Design a protein around this ligand. Structure first.
Ligand SMILES: C1C[C@@H](c2nc(C3CC3)no2)CN1
Length: 460
């Protein structure tokens, strides 16, 4: 039975509006409704992994697991195994996988983050799951961010608290937050970003939705505009939105958007918005292809419609050689040549690098770089040809070219990371000096760049 080099992943997000679901929710898992939808000819083909995020979920874990498993069994005739379930208040994440994957999945983590202080602590935050699928790390975040059209900045703050404080993946990757810990990271939920148009334009917006003319609405979507201005979700992807706004509907129909201000809304308007979203971030040059992104039309218990997204995701096998794991493979090496970091910091400390990768027995600390001034104000940290030669555990190019090197640049004075990035070993050539580049971030915000050349030796 061969190990896969691709799997498909279903991501669902649904704000259930504190109501039980209807008796049939299969359209959700089949990616049927509006937007980029899945071909009828695939309906019986199970996804490898289903990740369900709910918000305002009134069900017990048991109640929801029974509905989910019975739904998937009805669609696929497969009895899925529960990988993980984690709930914070009424925010929940469930991960189900095909039974054949049970001994491919390991290192299962769960965590949550509560966002806000005093007033603003008590119902918003995130839950997450991570695990290994053979040689591939997968992370999943379901977040319910702050509501309200005039709180986009609070949403952006919620995002930065969640990526700082959600403790998933390999705790040895200590300089790295979740945005660097996984081959593939999926972040979804009721992100609560709104279409920022005047209240008076509510009926105009509704008209546009009935005409399926989303362009003038998406140009005002706060998540798209905040992302374009690098305020949030830096280096994440989202598939083009081709489905109607998923909020705020009258319940038991989808024929009416309920946007007017009410006591129940705190006298806020809820103009039709794409609150419910799926984004991802994968390591450079790993296969990830969105194959569906849309909303259901027939699930009407909530004032939100469910959103689905499906992905092809590249995966690698758990590699064993005669040598590694448990020793180095003298036939392999990674050399970083003529490298320099460009940092936005005003601080004058010395800096050193750390190289972290599951292709190394443990992380490698460099010597300090040489600080110079850039022509436009910047700190440039030069490493020359002084960087430690990295000794991978396996030299086989079928393994090594699929790996990645995480880089942290740290202050000698404080040992704190000023920037984190990732370099793919999927090179155009081995034994050849080739340009490398990564942006550097810290707390998910841009702090600089790392660039130079790499020379990779494999056993071929
Ligand atoms: C309910 C179970 C659904 C299902 N059929 C299959 C295979 C074609 C035999 N896999 O799932 C069909 N109707």
């Amino acid at each position: 039975q061969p190990e896969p080099d691709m799997i498909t992943i279903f991501i669902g997000t649904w704000n259930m509006g504190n109501a039980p679901p209807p008796k049939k929710i299969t359209s959700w898992f089949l990616s049927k409704g509006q937007g980029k939808t899945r071909d009828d000819s695939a309906d019986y083909i199970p996804h490898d992994i289903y990740v369900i995020g709910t918000q305002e979920d009134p069900l017990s874990e048991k109640e929801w697991l029974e509905i989910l498993k019975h739904s998937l069994q009805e669609i696929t005739s497969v009895t899925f195994k529960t990988v993980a379930i984690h709930t914070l208040w009424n925010i929940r994440i469930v991960v189900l996988a095909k039974p054949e994957h049970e001994n491919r999945i390991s290192h299962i983590c769960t965590d949550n983050v509560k966002t806000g202080i005093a007033n603003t602590l008590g119902n918003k935050g995130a839950v997450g799951v991570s695990f290994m699928f053979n040689g591939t790390s997968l992370g999943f975040v379901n977040s319910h961010l702050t509501s309200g059209s005039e709180k986009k900045l609070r949403r952006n703050q919620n995002y930065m608290n969640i990526l700082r404080f959600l403790a998933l993946g390999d705790k040895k990757l200590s300089p790295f937050n979740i945005t660097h810990r996984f081959t593939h990271l999926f972040w979804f939920g009721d992100l609560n970003y709104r279409v920022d148009l005047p209240t008076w334009e509510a009926e105009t917006i509704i008209q546009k939705i009935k005409q399926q003319q989303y362009a003038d609405l998406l140009s005002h979507d706060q998540l798209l505009t905040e992302r374009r201005e690098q305020k949030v979700f830096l280096h994440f992807e989202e598939e083009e939105i081709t489905f109607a706004p998923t909020y705020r509907f009258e319940r038991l129909t989808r024929d009416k958007y309920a946007y007017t201000k009410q006591k129940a809304t705190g006298m806020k308007y809820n103009l039709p918005s794409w609150c419910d979203r799926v984004l991802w971030k994968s390591y450079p040059l790993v296969h990830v292809v969105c194959q569906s992104y849309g909303s259901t039309s027939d699930i009407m218990t909530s004032d939100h419609s469910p959103v689905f997204a499906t992905f092809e995701a590249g995966v690698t096998s758990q590699f064993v050689s005669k040598n590694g794991p448990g020793t180095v493979d003298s036939q392999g090496q990674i050399e970083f040549l003529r490298c320099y970091a460009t940092l936005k910091t005003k601080s004058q400390t010395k800096f050193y690098l750390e190289f972290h990768s599951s292709c190394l027995e443990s992380f490698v600390k460099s010597q300090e770089g040489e600080n110079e001034e850039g022509s436009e104000g910047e700190l440039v940290v030069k490493f020359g040809e002084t960087l430690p030669k990295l000794k991978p555990i396996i030299s086989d190019p079928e393994y090594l070219l699929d790996q990645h090197i995480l880089i942290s640049i740290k202050s000698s004075d404080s040992d704190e990371s000023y920037g984190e990035g990732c370099i793919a070993l999927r090179l155009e050539a081995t034994e050849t000096q080739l340009p490398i580049y990564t942006p550097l971030t810290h707390h998910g915000e841009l702090t600089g760049h790392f660039q130079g050349e790499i020379k990779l030796q494999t056993s071929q």
